[PDB]
Structures are given as C-alpha cells and as structure tokens.
Amino acid sequence: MSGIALSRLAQERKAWRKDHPFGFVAVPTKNPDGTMNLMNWECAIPGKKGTPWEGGLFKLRMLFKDDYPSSPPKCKFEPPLFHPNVYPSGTVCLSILEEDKDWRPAITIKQILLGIQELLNEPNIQDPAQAEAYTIYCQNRVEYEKRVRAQAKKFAPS
Amino acid sequence: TQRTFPGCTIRNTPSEPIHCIVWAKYLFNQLFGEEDADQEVSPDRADPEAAWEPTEAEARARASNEDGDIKRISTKEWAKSTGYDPVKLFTKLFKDDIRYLLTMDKLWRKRKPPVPLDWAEVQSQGEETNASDQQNEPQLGLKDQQVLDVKSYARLFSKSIETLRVHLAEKGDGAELIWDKDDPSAMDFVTSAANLRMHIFSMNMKSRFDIKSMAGN
C-alpha cells in the first residue's frame, strides 16, 4: 500500500545516489511545484561494452505500484526498441519483473537495470514479445545485427 | 569486463569447466549462505520442455498473485531438513538431479548426456582399481596441483559438508556464511563439487590449486 512503497522508493534513490554502475542513469520524475514522484522514474541504460548496442543510451520509464515492493516495477522503453523481449508498447519482459516468477521484494533497482542491459546482449528465446525481432533474430542474425547497430547509433548521445 | 554466467547453462549443460565451478559456487551459497530465486542449484520445474516457457503472464487456472511454489524452490530447506547429510546431498545433485535432467532429451541430441553417480558406486570404484584411498596414484610436484580421482573428490565433498555444517551451527540459526577462497573447507567444497559435476559430463577433472585460482578469480 501507499507510504510503504514510498519509504522503499526513497531508500532506492539514496542507495543509487551513493553507488551506481558508471553510465547508468536513474532519477524519479520531477512533479510540478518542486515535488517529486517516486512512483515514476526516468532511467537510461547505455549499451553494454562489446555488444552492437554499445554507444547508444536507451531511456525507459519505470512505473511503480502501491503494492511495491511486493509488486515488480514494470519498465517501458521510451521509445520501444528492436528487441524480441520488448513489446511494441515498450513493455520489457524479464523473469525478475514478475512477482509470480523470480521477482523478490529485496531486489534493488540496480539489479533490475543491470538485468535489462544484460537482456540486450542475451535475448530470451522463450519470450517472443516482439514477433518481428524474434523472427529476424532466429533466421537472420546478420540482418538483426544491422538493425541493432543502426539503433545504437540512432540513440547515441550527440 | 567479466562474462556473465546464465543460470540456464549453469543448471543445465555446462560445456565449460569454469561453468561447473561457478555452479559449485552457487551450490555453497544456496546451502550455507544467501538463498536466491534465479541463482538456485535445483532443477527448474518451469522448464520450457516441462511446463511453460515461461513467457510473460502465466497460463494456469490459479491466482497469479498467489503462486503455489513453481518458482520458489529452496534447496536450503531440504539441506537443513536432512541436517546437511553428505550422502543425501551427493545422491541428490550427482545422482537424482541429473537423472531428472536426463528427461529433457531435447538437451542431448549432439552432446554426450551426463551419467548419474551413486555414493555406493563411487565408494566401490569399478572403473579403476579400488586400491588404497589414502594414496594410489604416485605423482610429483605441488600436492595441491595433483588431480585426485572421483573417490577422492567424493569423500572430500562429504568432509567439507561436515566442517561447513558445524561452522554454520557455530554461528547459530538464520545465519549465512559467505563463500571465500582462503577457507580450506569452502575451497574443498567448491573444488569437489565442480570436479564431480564435470566428471558426470565426461569432462577432464581439475586440481584444487587450479580451481582455487579461478573460483576466486
């Protein structure tokens, strides 16, 4: 319920503000009147080194609920990216992003963000969120690389 | 940067020796340390060829917000219940688990499938001469660089469990021991477990010193 979630949300920001992976960006939305909405974060994840995603800064929106931290914070890419584990709506799919699956209330936002970056390199073939990407990735790795490479350069901080 | 080790290839088929060692590292943590959900050591019941994919949003006639226990398996519970018995644990991971894993024939269509090893069969070595357990293979050089046999790692694995169990008990209940590379017991455990796991997949065994260097990295 409310209050509880906000207490943990503030804790996450405190921990993240202290220590966080270099290149990763995460901060709650600045609600008008000098306030802040801890239930809505604007995070950004850069491409992992050694991958065709390297160089691109992908931004996503982290949506929180009142059931937090019991409920997982659904993250939607802004805008959605070409990835078989990312729905055209922007909804990212991950085992630890579902309570009934591998999500644990003790999971820090840091672990979630890192997991998303990892997913970019190693796509889950069990979750065909993006039919287009899934098909291309499965039958033509070359054509997939091209689209991913152009994507990184497209979202590259200029 | 270091390469990530996916739980799939760790729990399923570890084609690389280093993977068998990483598996053993998680094994220690899931027995005397921190218990994780994805970083478990037990065979997954939600395997794509067993139950679901499992793709986003479950597919069952039950409450999704009230899962029974499809993804909350805790090997630590069984270990604690058995009082950390070497035989029970050995016959579980190295005899029953891979046997259940063999059910997934889709995993063995090119790679040689694993062979289950029983505690009694390893004690009564039939593959080789069941000579003195103390020392049968005469070698020279670093003692820690001498690759032991399956019997050695089996009994060694059993002995490490003993010292680790009493070590945890000394800390009390609800305690969690973190794995280290300087602790003889913790190192012996990971070394034996890894060697046993790799031996099951017909992979060349490694020495304690060799593993110690990569286990701690």
UniProtKB/Swiss-Prot annotation, chain A:
Subcellular compartments: Nucleus; Cytoplasm; Cytoplasm, Perinuclear region
Gene3D superfamilies: Ubiquitin Conjugating Enzyme
Consequence recorded when altering residue 27 to A: Impairs binding to RANBP2
Site, as annotated: Substrate binding: 100-101
Annotated metabolic or biological route of this protein: Protein modification; protein sumoylation
Entry-annotated residues carrying N6-acetyllysine: 65
PROSITE patterns: UBC_1 (PS00183), UBC_2 (PS50127)
Numbered residues of crosslink Glycyl lysine isopeptide (Lys-Gly) (interchain with G-Cter in ubiquitin): 18
Glycyl lysine isopeptide (Lys-Gly) (interchain with G-Cter in SUMO1) cross-link, renumbered residues: 49
Record PTM text: Phosphorylation at Ser-71 significantly enhances SUMOylation activity.
EC number: 2.3.2.-
Cross-link (Glycyl lysine isopeptide (Lys-Gly) (interchain with G-Cter in SUMO2)): 18, 48-49, 101
Function per UniProt: Accepts the ubiquitin-like proteins SUMO1, SUMO2, SUMO3, SUMO4 and SUMO1P1/SUMO5 from the UBLE1A-UBLE1B E1 complex and catalyzes their covalent attachment to other proteins with the help of an E3 ligase such as RANBP2, CBX4 and ZNF451. Can catalyze the formation of poly-SUMO chains. Necessary for sumoylation of FOXL2 and KAT5. Essential for nuclear architecture and chromosome segregation. Sumoylates p53/TP53 at 'Lys-386'. Mediates sumoylation of ERCC6 which is essential for its transcription-coupled nucleotide excision repair activity.
Designated name of the protein: SUMO-conjugating enzyme UBC9
UniProtKB/Swiss-Prot annotation, chain B:
Crosslinked residue numbers (Glycyl lysine isopeptide (Lys-Gly) (interchain with G-Cter in SUMO1)): 71
Protein family per UniProt: Belongs to the ubiquitin-activating E1 family.
The record's account of how the chain is modified after translation: Sumoylated with SUMO1 and SUMO2/3 and by UBC9. Sumoylation at Lys-71 inhibits enzymatic activity. Sumoylation at the C-terminal lysine cluster plays an essential role in nuclear trafficking.
Name used for this protein in its record: SUMO-activating enzyme subunit 2
Function: The heterodimer acts as an E1 ligase for SUMO1, SUMO2, SUMO3, and probably SUMO4. It mediates ATP-dependent activation of SUMO proteins followed by formation of a thioester bond between a SUMO protein and a conserved active site cysteine residue on UBA2/SAE2.
Compartment list: Cytoplasm; Nucleus
Effect of residue 70 to A: Strongly reduced interaction with UBE2I
GO molecular function, one term: SUMO binding
Organism: Homo sapiens
An example Gene Ontology CC term for this record: nucleoplasm
Compositionally biased spans, kind Basic and acidic residues: 57-66
